Amino acid sequence: KWKLFKKIKFLHSAKKF
Incomplete structure (x- = not known):
């Protein structure tokens, strides 16, 4: 694993799109 x-x-x- 590295960074989930x-x-x-x-x-x-x-969020804001």
Whole structure:
């Protein structure tokens, strides 16, 4: 594993579109 917390960043990208 390296950094799955990045996937949670996708939730931020889904915020303001």
